[PDB]
Design brief:
Two copies of one chain form a homodimer. By secondary structure, chain A is of the alpha/beta class. The first copy, chain A, has one domain (1-197). Chain A is built from six helices and six strands; from the N terminus they run βααβαβααβαββ. The first copy, chain A, has helices spanning 13-17, 30-43, 56-66, 97-104, 118-135, 147-158; strands at residues 3-8, 49-52, 71-73, 140-145, 175-181, 184-192. Chain A has a six-stranded mixed sheet, sandwiched between helices. In chain A, a hairpin with a 2-residue loop joins strand 5 (175-181) and strand 6. The longest helix of chain A has 18 residues, at 118-135. Chain A is globular, with a radius of gyration of 16 Å. The two termini of chain A are 31 Å apart. At the A-B interface, strand 6 of A face strand 6 of B. Chains A, B: One of its GO terms (molecular function) is phosphatase activity. Chains A, B: Pfam families: His_Phos_1 (PF00300). Chains A, B: Substrate binds at residues 8-15, 57. Chains A, B: This is Phosphoglycerate mutase family protein, putative.
Chain lengths: 197, 197
């Protein structure tokens, strides 16, 4: 009866350009607002409580989804910091030794020079979501957040290795869901985007 | 772009009952037929080639999806044999030492007494899919098959360990998709069921 619904925020201009956002706070494009309205009509108020990253691309997506419910801001749902990667394209990072390790799995896949990795984030974010699921036991819970944050959460919840991150692709307003069996998370959908036109 | 689309067959009466099907060939329910039409309407003919398991629950689902396109039968796409487990619910198997192993990971997770495992089927199914994808390079490929077969496929394609099988749940007419970034599979969706009314 506990269902966790992770939803990636709608499109921003930097998503169009393939520029890494991290801690930047870029606004939705008009199309991303529409993606938000699209996912909102799909979810049609079929959830008990909704949480969001406070960054605007997420919050505005959440406010579209929420209907008559309050969006609860969660600081720990903000996007993963990407350090000096922010503002770059992944193509521009080929020289960077950290970027090699992010691909290969060394040091658990560092996010630039942030001192954090896919591995450490997996565990941290999975733990936040587990505590949320305990607080909201037997509810359907929507969390609106970011690409990197959601993918590390997936890995941490299912206890996958960090280079599995590069084998999941998550789109704007992609829907990802979990249920619990014997208290253990089970993935019931990943990046569902059929609501878009 | 090479795109692989894996779709589980529609509902069967045994799926409603939780009875394990394996090599049985139970027909679709009327609601299963309706699921198949709804997934066909979602896919809207947007693929180059469709393949199917020859078991009727799959073939009929595939024919609704296919429209005018020819369905290609692939023997290797038939459901995984479940041995003595066929006809039982998972609750009925709690005495069986092989069922304990299937859940724990011992011997790569055996399918009852068939001498094959989640581990062996993962490798075999991934190989079959990678061959069909090399053979239909730059095409969009639909394969209509079964829950267990598709789950082992995902595991083999993503190089995941056998107990991960229990962390994925796939529904009737659930859509799962892969792309290839230079021959390496990337999961772009799992168990999308939004097309279901």
């Amino acid at each position: 009866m506990t269902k966790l619904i992770l939803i990636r925020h709608g499109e921003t201009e930097w998503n169009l350009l393939g520029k890494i956002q991290g801690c930047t706070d870029i606004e939705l494009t008009p199309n991303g607002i529409q993606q938000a309205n699209e996912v909102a009509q799909q979810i049609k108020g079929n959830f008990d409580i909704i949480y969001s990253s406070p960054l605007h691309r997420a919050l505005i997506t959440a406010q579209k989804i929420a209907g008559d419910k309050e969006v609860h801001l969660i600081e720990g749902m903000k996007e993963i910091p990407f350090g000096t990667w922010e503002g770059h394209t992944f193509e521009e990072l080929n020289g960077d030794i950290n970027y090699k390790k992010f691909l290969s799995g060394e040091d658990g896949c560092p996010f630039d020079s942030t001192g954090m990795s896919i591995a450490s984030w997996s565990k941290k974010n999975a733990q936040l979501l587990l505590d949320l699921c305990k607080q909201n036991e037997n509810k359907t819970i929507v969390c609106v957040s970011h690409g990197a944050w959601i993918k590390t959460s997936i890995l941490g919840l299912l206890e996958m290795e960090p280079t599995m991150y590069h084998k999941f692709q998550l789109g704007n307003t992609g829907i990802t869901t979990f249920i619990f069996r014997h208290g253990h998370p089970v993935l019931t959908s990943f990046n569902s985007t059929q609501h878009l036109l």
